[PDB]
């Protein structure tokens, strides 16, 4: 009874190049593989190509990459094992990839010019030529200039420029941008269009903790910090208020106005407790932030800046407890590994924190750089709701002051109750491309048919491709085998690792078992761009000197540069364009849309962002939504 | 001076971009390790900052990437900064300051800072003098310079001082502009809004439509106004439809088993089923997984109805039995419409179809029935023998033209019968009874748009209450001629009797399935999917905008299309025009002209929120008495507000008077600003812990001289609530000029400095000396006057001088004996000692006309020669006579020659 199957993404995308793994278990000789893809419904013929043959050679694990040119649309995805067919719809993302957009400054005065950039890529994050539509909204939402422009022979890098005319509306002004073949999906900046001059210093407000603990008797301790955009520490006056936000609402504490002398280049002011409770019991509090609103003036008050950090959260702890990154099913009596991140009260990262599960007695782990921790606990082969509850043991602190958190992990379910499991174990540290990782191949069966899994099958999930695919021999009697995977610059920032195995057994019944995890790379540039000083030597330069800017990059990549004087960013920071802000967009695409695991095999795949269907009726649940559930 | 470098020698600091290296450039150095390095040589700008330079890389093999920020710091020992507004009514005198940063480690700097000079501007600082302070900056410190000046031109005009120290080669300038704008308020008003629908009151004759300018009478002179034309696309479609929920389908996905005919009872449902399902595009809601198991069980019906074809290429229950005329029609019919869902050979289809033709077709055109299928239940309404010669000529009639196109080139004699029978339908339509015959046969006929005139009015009048089309028996050969009469309605395109039909087919709540339901089954779903294809869904944008502005030369045209992510367009023009739009074609649009521009104000002050009094007394070297009186004009009392002083260029306050003032509540004064000192606190910053709405809190304080010279800048004082800068109000003080107002004649909007010369001059005053003064190219008018009226007023006097005689006539075409208003500032009524009754020797320039002509009135600037005239009975004062012969000698040496050049 040979078994043909079938895995590709659970969403396909136009003008991309999707993978798709082909299969056979138990076959002999060689076998010929035609794929197919045809628009949902009928016939259209989208893609005829791509027919291989799976040699005894390659254990039968063949491969065809395929393009698909170019209410939601379907196709359906066809596969013909020498007389044998195997057809399955999958969804279709219109989605293109994605646009950045890049102007100069992020402020602009009535009468300049904004000049902007658009970034094509595809989903692959690699440059793409496609017809680009530019809108330019006013405040209140009006387009004021919309180009047609296309990134063909233009390395996916449009500039464009915009002259704002000395008769326009102040405030928030809009960049939408989006590719012709999707109108759906759009891209946006915002740039902010008001009367203004640079100003010749800034001013820096930090609060000692980034949070606010209702029961510190001290307060709210803030530096006022202020500097000459050249270096030169300043000399004046600050005046400094405090306020509580929940959660649009803003409401001004008035008797926490003061008024300090910056001198050094520093001031210190603080809100005490009392102040702040008689501006409104005290647990009433918790939830809400505070806000410091700071105004320095040089003591020659030629000129005045105002700076202002909000947000600073008021806790009963230091500390917050996230299961985001653990598995949500285990494996009925084997070991389950957690994956606890702790943030600070702000959303960041909170290293080096202990924590452990209930009770515990020895159990416990630190939080490490990225702020997860790696906890294991042992499991009964109970098909009843594992519940885990989290702390959290930092001394200095006391059992009041740390964080919780409680999951729920259900157990994998079993093919017809056979119970066969699949573990998949990985040595927690941030992993860096260049390294290689040991993913540990668990297995648990009755040993009256141990011996017929030979191999398990791998799947690495990526941006939301295959990034690979692969075969993990396994001789008889092996529980525990280990995969040498090298870590590369495609890995980045995250991968999923899916990986099954089929048997017979039962009653001559067909049973696979598969199991996922979630591996987080330390995140960068793929490649390298770095810019420094040419010049070997020296101190600082003097207006209207030349000076040699090395750029040190990948050979045939196309740089485009730009300066800005640090004192724009004194009025706005904001919507700057970072490669921290791409993998943020980047990740929240991803067709997988969870940490790893599933309720059944069926499950592991489609939670993962996999399609498996076989010629022994075993596919997975057919995705109708674009988005992850929620 | 001496040993310093001179204003010529100083090149100013005037690059001040907010950013550049705007860049693109490619890395194709060779590479080493796969690592290009590019070197760019660049100029950096004259800023004295921080520079952040921020490079983003695109690769086609690894993507993309944003570099880490690198700054570059730009720095300078010794240098100024000039903080400018970004803008500065016209007209208005306001106060800019210059700071002078010495960070030399221990070297103090004796520095000599100096406005220049511009025409645009009324400052102390004139062509031919100079506006130079001479100041000490202590090492390691800064120096705040104020100047006060007064932009009389709008637009992008440009200040710039410049700075030297001394006994040292130490220089710096800068030079930076500022937007310099009128007086008015913006005002927006709508122009046109006309609604663009040719056809729709905008005749045939495609609509034009008139469009005036603005008004724009209140407009601000010197001021640009935008229009902007805008195209706003009226949509709103909806040909809507309600489609049978899939869900109610399920029982329709029958497997097909049994004979010729039971075969064919269990495909109808099926291939049925699955067209239905591919048109509504329901197949998510049913299960998108069922589709291909549909598909098996509609190409193993097709198999399993080959083993029933005779080779006659007929059909019939059995394979002994005699072929069915019916049934090899229905054959033709289901496979006709499963063509694109299975493999329908053209061999067997086309085949019953040429047996149809040749075989079970009389001469007249009508079919007949010679082997009745055995389930006389799946035929539907043809069991019913009343009219079966018109039913089932309609009914082959109608399987072989929904087989034409797979059967013309294969069939040559399809042409042939399907014209005849057609004829015999045509003609016998006339004659019909039953509804059901009716609406079978009118689709037979309207497919070849052969149903017109009494045979179309016949069709719809067969209709009860005009939505069904039913006969006195069994409901579904009433689904079924309903399902016919739909499918008839859809070929001729009447799309106005068609929603009434369909609505009574939903309210059917008819799903096919049941005893004998082989033809409603597949009518009635094939009606209700053909209903989905022949929309439309809108109608149609399809708008051709054409704008004709007579500024451009070129027409603009715009194509508004439906299936546009726009359907707006908008353009743009620096000048109010009066245009026309020519719209042409289908749909409703919109057009909307917005200009902008600055109105007319009528003023405020403005400060809105301060009160504002400052005064400058002597006191009981100079020394004077400098008070202040401010009031916030809220209904609560004003919080922590800021004091910001400027000094009469020269003086410094009296540090006893601020001690006084620090250790008052609710003020304060920096330790810093203490212990300045006469070195040079030329600024000065009261913080205010509150200031009262009620009444005014004054303070004063003593100001102190130390080094005296002529011509003194006016003080500034400036107060506002930390919170908010705009929110201010700024007051001026001067021991003499009005309130700190340097000196400036108005008329409207125009105004021109008059810091200056109250005339030329005053060794000896010759006749030479007259001639060639009074015959300088620039010269124009010369008149010897008579002072009838002076007027005093609180800035300009009025010398209403009768002129006597015109020596030199100019532009003004003045004849002798009326009279010119010669205006001069209040500054001048003491050196010009003009006294009435008495005559003078006057003459200017033409620059120095006030006003438009005939009305002009003469000023007396530094170009302007005023010479005391003795009397008739003067002139024998032995000590006049040395004047009076030389102004009696000017008087004939101007009258006869004029000028020598
Ligand atoms: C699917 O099967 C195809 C063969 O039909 C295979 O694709 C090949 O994938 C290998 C690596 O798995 C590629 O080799 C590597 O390519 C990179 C650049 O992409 C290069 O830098 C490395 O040095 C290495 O040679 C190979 O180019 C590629 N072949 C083709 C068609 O271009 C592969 O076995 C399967 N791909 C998967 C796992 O999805
Ligand atoms: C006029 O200005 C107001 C704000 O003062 C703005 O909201 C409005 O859009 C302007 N009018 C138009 C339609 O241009």
Known sequence: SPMYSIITPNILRLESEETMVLEAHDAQGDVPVTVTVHDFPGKKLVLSSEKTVLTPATNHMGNVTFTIPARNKFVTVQATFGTQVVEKVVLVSLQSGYLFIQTDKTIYTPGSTVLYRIFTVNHKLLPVGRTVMVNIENPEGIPVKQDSLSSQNQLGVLPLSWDIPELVNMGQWKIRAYYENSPQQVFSTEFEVKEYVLPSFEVIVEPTEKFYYIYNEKGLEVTITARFLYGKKVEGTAFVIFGIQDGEQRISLPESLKRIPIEDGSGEVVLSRKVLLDGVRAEDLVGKSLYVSATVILHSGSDMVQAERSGIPIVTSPYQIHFTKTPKYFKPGMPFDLMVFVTNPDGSPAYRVPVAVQGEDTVQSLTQGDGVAKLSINTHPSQKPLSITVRTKKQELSEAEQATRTMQALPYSTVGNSNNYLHLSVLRTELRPGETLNVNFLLRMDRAHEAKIRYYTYLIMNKGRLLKAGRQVREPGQDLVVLPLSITTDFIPSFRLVAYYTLIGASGQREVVADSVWVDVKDSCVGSLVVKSGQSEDRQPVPGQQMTLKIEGDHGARVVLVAVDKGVFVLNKKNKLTQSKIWDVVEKADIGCTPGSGKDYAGVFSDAGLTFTSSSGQQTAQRAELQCPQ | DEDIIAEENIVSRSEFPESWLWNVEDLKEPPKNGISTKLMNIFLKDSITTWEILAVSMSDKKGICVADPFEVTVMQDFFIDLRLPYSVVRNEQVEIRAVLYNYRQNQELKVRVELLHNPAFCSLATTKRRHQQTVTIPPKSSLSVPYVIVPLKTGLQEVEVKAAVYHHFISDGVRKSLKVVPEGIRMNKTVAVRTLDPERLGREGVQKEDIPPADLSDQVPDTESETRILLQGT???????????????????????????????????????????????????????????????????????????????????????????????????????????????????????????????????????????????????????????????????????????????????????????????????????????????????????????????????????????????????????????????????????????????????????????????????????????????????????????????????????????????????????????????????????????????????????????????????????????????????????????????????????????????????????????????????????????????????????????????????????????????????????????????????????????????????????????????????????????????????????????????????????????????????????????????????????????????????????????????????????????????????????????
């Open chain 2, 235 to 901: 949509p709103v479609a909806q040909m809507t439809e309600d489609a049978v929920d899939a869900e109610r389908l399920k029982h329709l996905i029958v497997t097909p088993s049994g004979c010729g005919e039971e075969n064919m009872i269990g495909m109808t449902p099926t291939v049925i089923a699955v067209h239905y399902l591919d048109e509504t595009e329901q197949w998510e809601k049913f299960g998108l997984e069922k589709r291909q198991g549909a598909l098996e069980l509609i190409k193993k019906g097709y198999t399993q109805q080959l083993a029933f074809r005779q080779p006659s290429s007929a059909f019939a229950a059995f394979v002994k039995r005699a072929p069915s005329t019916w049934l090899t029609a229905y054959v033709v019919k289901v496979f006709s419409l499963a063509v694109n869902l299975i493999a329908i050979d053209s061999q067997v289809l086309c085949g019953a179809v040429k047996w149809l033709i040749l075989e079970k077709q009389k001469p007249d055109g009508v079919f007949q029935e010679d082997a009745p299928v055995i389930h006389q239940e799946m035929i539907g309404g043809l069991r019913n023998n009343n009219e079966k010669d018109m039913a089932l000529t309609a009914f082959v009639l109608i399987s072989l033209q929904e087989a034409k196109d797979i059967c013309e080139e294969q069939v040559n004699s399809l042409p042939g019968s399907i014209t005849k029978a057609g004829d015999f339908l045509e003609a016998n339509y006339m004659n019909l009874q039953r509804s059901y015959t009716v609406a079978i046969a009118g689709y037979a006929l309207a497919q070849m748009g052969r149903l017109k005139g009494p045979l179309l009015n016949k069709f719809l009048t067969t209709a009860k209450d005009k939505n069904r089309w039913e006969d006195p028996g069994k409901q579904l050969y009433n689904v079924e001629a309903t399902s016919y009469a739909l499918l008839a309605l859809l070929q001729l395109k009447d799309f106005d009797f068609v929603p009434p039909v369909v609505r009574w087919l939903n309210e059917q709540r008819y799903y096919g399935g049941g005893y004998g339901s082989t033809q409603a089954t597949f009518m009635v779903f094939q009606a209700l999917a053909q209903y989905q294809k022949d929309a439309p869904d809108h109608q149609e944008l399809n708008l051709d905008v054409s704008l004709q502005l007579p500024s451009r030369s070129s027409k603009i045209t715009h194509r508004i299309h439906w299936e546009s992510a726009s359907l707006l367009r908008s353009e743009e023009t620096k000048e109010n025009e009066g245009f026309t739009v020519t719209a042409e074609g289908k749909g409703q649009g919109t057009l909307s002209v917005v200009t902008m521009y600055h109105a007319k104000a009528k003023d405020q002050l403005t400060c809105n929120k301060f009160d504002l009094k400052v005064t400058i007394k002597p006191a009981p070297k100079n020394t004077m008495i400098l008070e202040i009186c401010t009031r916030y004009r809220g209904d609560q009392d004003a919080t922590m507000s800021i004091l910001d002083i400027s000094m009469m260029t020269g003086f410094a306050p009296d540090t006893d008077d601020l001690k006084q003032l620090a250790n008052g509540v609710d003020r304060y004064i920096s330790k810093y600003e203490l212990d300045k000192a006469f070195s040079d606190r030329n600024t000065l910053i009261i913080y205010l812990d509150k200031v009262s709405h009620s009444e005014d809190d004054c303070l004063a304080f003593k100001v102190h001289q130390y080094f005296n010279v002529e011509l003194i800048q006016p003080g500034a004082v400036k107060v506002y609530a930390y919170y908010n800068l705009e929110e201010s109000c700024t007051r001026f003080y001067h021991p003499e000029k009005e309130d700190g107002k340097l000196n400036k004649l108005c008329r409207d909007e125009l105004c021109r400095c008059a810091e200056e010369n109250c005339f030329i001059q005053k060794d000896k005053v010759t006749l030479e000396e007259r001639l060639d003064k009074a015959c300088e190219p620039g010269v124009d008018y010369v008149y010897k006057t008579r002072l009838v009226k002076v007027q005093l007023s609180n800035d300009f006097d009025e010398y209403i001088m009768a002129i006597e005689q015109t020596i030199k006539s100019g532009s003004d075409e003045v004849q002798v004996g009326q009279q010119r208003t010669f205006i001069s500032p209040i500054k001048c009524r003491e050196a010009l000692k003009l006294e009435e009754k008495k005559h003078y020797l006057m003459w200017g320039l033409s620059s120095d006309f006030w006003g438009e002509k005939p009305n002009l009135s003469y000023i007396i600037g530094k170009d302007t020669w005023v010479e005391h005239w003795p009397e008739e009975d003067e002139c024998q004062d032995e000590e006049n006579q040395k004047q009076c012969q030389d102004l009696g000698a000017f008087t004939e040496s101007m009258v006869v020659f004029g000028c020598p050049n």
